[PDB]
Design a binder for these strands. Structure first.
Ligand code: MG
Lengths: 337, 336
DNA sequence: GGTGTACAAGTATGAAATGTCGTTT
DNA sequence: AAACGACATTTCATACTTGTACACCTGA
DNA sequence: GGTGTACAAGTATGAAATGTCGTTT
DNA sequence: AAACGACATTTCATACTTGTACACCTGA
DNA sequence: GGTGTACAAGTATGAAATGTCGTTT
DNA sequence: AAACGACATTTCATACTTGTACACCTGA
């Protein structure tokens, strides 16, 4: 028994044993059995050989025509980066599966879009832009992160329920997890800090609130702790979000009469807020799947964490603002990647 | 020139030509060159033919021994269905990458879990098993759907943003969308329907509320409507154990109509036809939809409920049995 | 920020598959 | 000459390992 | 409850690869 | 006989097109 | 929804324009 | 009719609570 390839392999052999084309077939036939290629084929083969050849592979056959240029489909991506296969299958007068494949046939993967903080509008971006433009402007003259202190305020739900992803045979159901209670115990901690480390942190009582005075009282307690915890600082650059409670007529005056550099920070720019993006964020993660039995436990936890984190950490967080702005700007104020 | 495959093929030729090993070999050298297998080899090859073992392909040779047996790592899935590779790994003293694959090898894929309403306290489940148990029992006797009217209430924000999914070259930004303002312009539709269709529905104006008072009034308008649209009508009202629904006030407001309060277990939106099936459809339907006007909403709703094929409603109300048959056989823990 | 997966590219396993050689036929 | 009967010495789909690449999450 | 992606199977291109056959040497 | 022009006859990777299968959404 | 200022718009409360009196030419 | 001082009694410029609006977090 021979085949269709190894077969022709033999004629190469013959071709080197000088046995003439037709000559070879003669053996070839009698070699195995009549059920084999023709003479003609061997002449052709030999003909192909004489020139200096060898079947690297059969040459590409005839194939139907591409029902649609390749980039013709790439145009659409260019228009709407995120459509559905079904959608393109229509714009292309094709099936969807069809597109499934062309897509594979090109780098193309499917990614989910980032969620972003707000529909920033003209005037808002414009603000951001400059803001950084400036801060960044000064960060060049010289580093003042070295003397800047920030802090913001974010919740801490007593139950971070994690949706669990599980490994299993297809058609097999995954681990189901119980939704969170939209109205359950949650303390609203707020903290301040700077490059060298944290500074002072209060954890409100479950269901507590921050008022204009409330705020004030806090800076104060803050200060007392600051001076003691921080030598050098005995100006200091304060950076906090344009809340309504931080944009307090009183506090503006409780701050001024306290003397602190009220560092600017555009509206809706939490990606410009270290406490936000780098600090809370870190927490965010390891703040997960975690459940909190009692308020004290949370504080209990807040402490451990805050501590363990090598001084380095914070440094970075704070020492990011540069690049952060640098983006804020280059991005023309739009948020950024 | 030849190779290893083709070569072997030659000694297939030669064989059949009653040519000898040490003979085939001779040719083989004069054929291509001296850069051809060892005569020895041929001989060996020959023996393989005496048996007719026409070597179709080579044969698996040396290989390291499996570090960790197969159903071994699979036995850890049986414990915690969903661990991380880094974790299964670190329990089989083997690199992670390593795992990725043995998983890959076994017909194993990862899929994210289902979300579900609430943790059912040992007790809370008992409640459900019976509640169903019973209805299900009542159903065997008679088919009381043909007269079942239910309704629950659901919000409707004016903007419903959806994280977008874009196609592009690896490492590349996907078209991003801006977060929904959690607090914002939203209405609060309230509707009742039955197997045959929708009967009546109010859409409480922006930042609206509901109080025993209000509901009564609703329950009532409902009736009116119900009657002028539903000839035949006893009647079975199925509605969640809200606070404004378990109020003695309305407890009477219903009694004063014969209306049959069907039974129902707390934390059980998955037996709320009005919920798991009516809204449900609507949900997709409201995707990425924007509403510039409170009326625009009322508009859509109308158009929609019109659009809905009659049968659809039926199905929703006829799922009820299967649903319970499940409800029970699951012991309360919601199903799937 | 912090993980989690899966490609890419090295490092061994180890029994073929081949080779070398002295020895039977 | 033509095989053999022993060990050497190449061979090469395996199992695993580092090394990355990179979708995505996390703060809003 | 609804829809979006991809693994199956079929199925018509259509030119390279292969056949059949009467010339040519 | 050996091989070549000439007009028929296969092949086989393609490009799509129905069928599904099934993760994951939605309702909460 | 939570918390603030800036401003429009219904109210208490204090200060001019008036009204009622009693008294003398 | 005349023209005061004294107390009422209405009027009206003006110092309080109220009640909307838009703003910035957030997103439970
Ligand atoms: Mg409800």
């Amino acid at each position: 028994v021979p085949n269709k390839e190894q077969t022709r392999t033999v004629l190469i052999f013959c071709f080197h044993l000088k046995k003439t084309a037709a000559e070879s077939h003669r053996m070839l036939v009698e070699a195995f059995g009549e059920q084999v290629p023709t003479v003609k084929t061997c002449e052709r083969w030999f003909q192909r050989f004489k020139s200096g050849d060898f079947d690297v592979d059969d040459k590409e056959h005839g194939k139907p025509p591409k029902r649609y240029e390749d980039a013709e489909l790439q145009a659409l991506l260019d228009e709407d980066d995120a459509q559905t296969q079904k959608q393109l299958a229509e714009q292309l007068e094709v099936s969807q599966q069809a597109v499934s494949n062309r897509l594979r046939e090109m780098g193309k993967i499917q990614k989910v879009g980032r969620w972003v903080p707000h529909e920033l509008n003209e005037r808002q971006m414009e603000r951001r832009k400059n803001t950084c433009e400036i801060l960044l402007s000064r960060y060049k003259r010289k580093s003042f992160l070295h003397r800047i202190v920030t802090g913001d305020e974010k919740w801490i739900f007593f139950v971070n329920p994690k949706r669990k992803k599980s490994y299993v045979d297809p058609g097999q159901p995954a681990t189901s997890t119980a939704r969170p209670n939209r109205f359950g115990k949650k303390t609203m901690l707020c903290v301040w800090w700077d490059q060298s480390g944290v500074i002072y942190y209060e954890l409100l009582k479950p269901g507590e609130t921050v008022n204009a005075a409330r705020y004030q009282q806090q800076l104060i307690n803050l200060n007392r702790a600051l001076q003691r915890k921080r030598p050098e600082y005995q100006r200091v650059i304060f950076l906090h979000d344009n809340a309504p409670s931080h944009t307090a007529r009183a506090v503006r005056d409780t701050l001024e009469t306290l003397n602190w550099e009220v560092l600017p920070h555009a509206a809706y720019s939490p990606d410009l807020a270290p406490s936000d993006y780098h600090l809370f964020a870190s927490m965010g993660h390891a703040l997960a799947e975690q459940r909190f039995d009692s308020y004290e436990s949370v504080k209990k936890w807040l402490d451990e964490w805050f501590a363990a984190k090598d001084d380095e950490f914070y440094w970075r967080g704070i020492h990011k603002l540069p690049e952060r702005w640098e983006k804020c700007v280059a991005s023309d104020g739009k948020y950024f990647e």
